[PDB]
Ligand binder design. Structure first.
Ligand SMILES: N[C@@H](Cc1c[nH]c[nH+]1)C(=O)O
Ligand SMILES: N[C@@H](Cc1c[nH]c[nH+]1)C(=O)O
Ligand SMILES: Nc1cccc2cnccc12
Ligand SMILES: Nc1cccc2cnccc12
Lengths: 415, 415
């Protein structure tokens, strides 16, 4: 009987049609990274499990696709890339010249719904100032504009965790509870306030402390945060600098302040941001932030400032489909070379060689078939031109060329 | 203390330097596939284990990186791509238009030495005739020529399993032993004749039968095979057609007949081939062949002719390094925008925007630093041009431009 034609649970196949859609997306990721001066890197999908043991109750680490090798070693299919980046960065030490701007498009994994997705990662390493976050946010807007979206379709919500850090510290809560608190508060929009309030109670935070978090999360503007913490709290000056810089780059209509944005990851220390559709129909398009302590927690002797984001391949595609910005673009090829019959095949191969030699994409009809079915084939594969190689033209040093989107042409004139 | 900076056992990191080498290779794979009219596809690295249970004692299936999920399902990190391709092909059925020419560059996995490698796969589906093998072999030569190699450096050895099939059948050996026999005979060059002879004895093949295999493997030319099986054995006409066609395409100096080539995979039915360095220093550069029965064994109601090859990312790189064809090509960027000081940053961002708007790759100096260190940075990141944004030029609607591989220029003139 049949073998199982469906892919493994939660995983996608990319036959040519779907692959073209993915490549359209990835081409933008690559093109944007190049426009912004980022350098590509990669690392193994298989990493040590201990790389992701952060103990803050993170969704990303709770849903880890992990297993034990035959030699008893605890590994996982990476749930995200940032730990791999830091590993690479630590490996280089003082040999890594800074600042560094590194990007990748890893497939990342989870176990629970989809179990895999691709995630464009962009990170700036060695830059203390908000200029890093500005560039990253502009890179994300650029990718989206490149895909056909506008500031009418999407935006980027931006906040700083430092604001909340103050409230946590000032309430007497030891800072080891800060990350788990961000993690729980990250669920605030999704699940009820009672549930989030309940989760914070379990961590030992008192009712007063919880209340102070709620209020600051609901503050609707930077001037309101300034009233609460001061116009020269670390966060106020950074955010103002950030908006001033994004404005200057011409993307002011894409970004805004939102005090409810914290992200679900333990390691963010400063500015955080996430992309969203302005119709409120989809989950976050991308998300990122500054994580200045991570390399220190991995054992770096010297603190390494870092900031970056991930930008998934799934939500963006749903948005683009909704907006009618992913028309099927069929496969194309420049030339299809058609032997008049099998006796002409050697000659048609010589023609095939010349066409490809000149940088053209070209097929030759591989089967034995009638000239008209060859033309049908040429049309199906999206050929710009059909080149018929028939005995009578060949003797004259020519072929029959026909534009598809039949005049005899000398061989040398083909290209 | 430190986290483990080394990657998981047998797996490679690709920091920007190494990633550039890989991208140089992959660009050729992609460029060649496009020149030859192949369409990209992909599938999950995680496949069902049962997809690879072929029971012929294959190295590829013996060294399978497999595990059991938490839900008891037997899966594996794919040891090769061809089973995934067939799965995809079967899923499509009559909706798949033929012939089809599909390619991918999957990371493939093994457990035992390296445990991962990338493998360019190229396959032609729905083509009975040797024209498929011709195109595939030419594609492999093309990729190698594109990388800087010549027919002096490398070649492609070519054979047909049909020859050996006859000897196996004519000796009374039931055809269910044919694949395991190819598998054992594949080891002939590597391990001693005694060991290969011994492995064939264990399968129940008699001394006479073994002898007949040895002789045919050592036959040095097609005329010698013709003497043995006939000038119109299936194999003779196919091979002659194959060499005639590769000759006509202009790659005759790249290919040759070798009766010892069988490949290690169970499913090859016809022509098989493998690339090699002409100094005898390296293992096979690539390998492939026709596998007309595979889709039938997976349950296809109608036989689907297929042929293809895999071309690894490791051996080719060692060869290219030996031949001095992988010089380090440093990272480049067109422009580096340098704010004279922080007050000029908003203006420098506007300049940054314009440059990128025009399709240029551009950095802006993200840190606070002196103009000369900014220039050093520009040189380190391989900038073609440094664009200094200073207050006095700005008032005149200009910036200072300096070619690195300082004249005031109007903004509009930059691009
Ligand atoms: N790893 C984060 C994104 C990120 C990259 N760099 C910094 N943050 C995520 O998966 O959401
Ligand atoms: N899967 C084969 C190569 C191949 C692709 N298509 C046909 N053969 C290998 O790994 O060697
Ligand atoms: N959020 C996510 C993390 C890791 C892997 C994923 C796979 N599919 C969807 C979402 C994922
Ligand atoms: N031959 C091979 C098959 C599957 C995975 C591999 C990883 N590294 C080297 C060789 C491999």
């Amino acid at each position: 009987n049949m073998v199982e034609t469906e892919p493994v649970q939660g995983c996608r196949d990319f036959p040519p049609e779907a692959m073209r859609c993915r490549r359209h997306l990835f081409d933008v990721f690559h093109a944007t990274a190049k426009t912004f001066g980022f350098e590509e890197y990669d690392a193994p999908v298989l990493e040590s499990e201990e790389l992701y043991i952060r103990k803050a109750g993170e969704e990303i680490t709770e849903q880890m696709f992990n297993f034990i090798t035959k030699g008893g070693h605890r590994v996982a299919l990476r749930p995200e890339m940032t730990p791999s980046l830091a590993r690479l960065l630590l490996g280089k030490g003082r040999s890594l010249l800074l600042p560094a701007k590194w990007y990748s498009i890893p497939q990342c994994w989870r176990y629970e719904r989809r179990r895999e997705h691709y995630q464009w990662n962009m990170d700036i390493v060695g830059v203390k100032s908000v200029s890093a976050e500005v560039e990253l946010v502009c890179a994300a807007c650029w990718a989206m504009r490149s895909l056909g979206l506008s500031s009418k379709d999407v935006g980027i919500k931006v906040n700083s965790r430092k604001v909340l850090q103050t409230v946590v510290e000032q309430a007497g809560v030891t800072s080891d509870k800060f990350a788990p608190v961000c993690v729980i508060v990250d669920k605030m929009e999704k699940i009820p306030r009672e549930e989030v309030e309940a989760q914070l109670a379990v961590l030992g935070l008192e009712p007063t402390v919880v209340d102070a978090i709620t209020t600051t999360l609901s503050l609707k503007s930077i001037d309101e945060i300034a009233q609460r913490v001061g116009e020269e709290h670390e966060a106020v000056k950074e955010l103002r600098q950030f908006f001033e810089q994004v404005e200057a780059y011409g993307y002011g209509d894409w970004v805004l302040f939102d005090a409810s944005v914290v992200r679900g990851l333990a390691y963010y220390t400063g500015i955080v941001f996430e992309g969203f559709d302005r119709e409120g129909k989809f989950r976050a398009l991308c998300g990122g932030g500054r994580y200045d302590n991570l390399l220190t927690t991995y054992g770096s002797p010297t603190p390494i400032p870092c900031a970056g984001f991930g930008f998934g391949d799934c939500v963006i595609v749903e948005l683009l489909q909704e907006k009618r910005l992913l028309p099927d673009i069929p496969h194309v090829v420049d030339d299809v070379v058609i032997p008049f019959d099998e006796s002409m095949r050697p000659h048609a191969l010589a023609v095939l060689r010349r066409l490809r030699d000149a940088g053209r994409s070209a097929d030759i009809i591989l089967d034995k078939k009638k000239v008209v079915q060859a033309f049908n084939y040429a049309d199906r594969v999206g050929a710009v031109r059909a080149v018929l190689v028939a005995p009578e033209e060949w003797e004259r040093g020519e072929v029959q060329v026909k534009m598809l989107r039949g005049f005899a042409v000398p061989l040398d004139r083909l290209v």
